[PDB]
Design a binder for this molecule. Sequence first.
Ligand code: Z80
Ligand code: CA
Ligand code: CA
Ligand code: CA
Ligand code: CA
Lengths: 89, 89
Amino acid sequence: MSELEKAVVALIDVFHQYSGREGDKHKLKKSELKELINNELSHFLEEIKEQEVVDKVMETLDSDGDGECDFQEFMAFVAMITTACHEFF
Amino acid sequence: MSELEKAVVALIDVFHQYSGREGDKHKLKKSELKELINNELSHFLEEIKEQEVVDKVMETLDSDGDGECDFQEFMAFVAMITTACHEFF
Ligand SMILES: CN(C)CCCN1c2ccccc2Sc2ccc(Cl)cc21
Ligand SMILES: [Ca+2]
Ligand SMILES: [Ca+2]
Ligand SMILES: [Ca+2]
Ligand SMILES: [Ca+2]
């Protein structure tokens, strides 16, 4: 697989690794998002150390008002991050 | 860097290796998009070698009508591919 293909599979791989941990296996609840951020985005984003910060990130990424982050909501997030990274270049 | 961080930077690195070959260094003209797809998406997509197929794909991805694919347009393309792959699993 090419560099691009590996990255696409990796976005899926990571989402599922965290979403699959508790309850709905296709959505990130607040605990799993916190773990994803803390363990997969430790160079790009501040560590979240407080629940009320977690709560605040979730309500942003959660567009459909269900309290959790689904794959399309996670892709929105990844696009936000990649755009900030691209701009930084 | 984590699986996720590597994947973000790969999206950038791939776009810019193809975008910087001709003309605008931050956009993909048709020839650059052609080779990116042909060389970086070969397990996901069929190769494209007829100019009216290239035209049609560019027409699909070009949202601002300048005849090129910029980075936000490439990320839209990536999220598409990523969504289709997630669907399969
Ligand atoms: C382009 N450069 C000079 C920054 C390098 C990339 N880089 C980075 C980039 C943008 C935002 C945050 C970071 S954290 C980081 C931590 C370790 C390493 Cl090894 C690299 C990075
Ligand atoms: Ca879950
Ligand atoms: Ca949601
Ligand atoms: Ca170019
Ligand atoms: Ca365009």
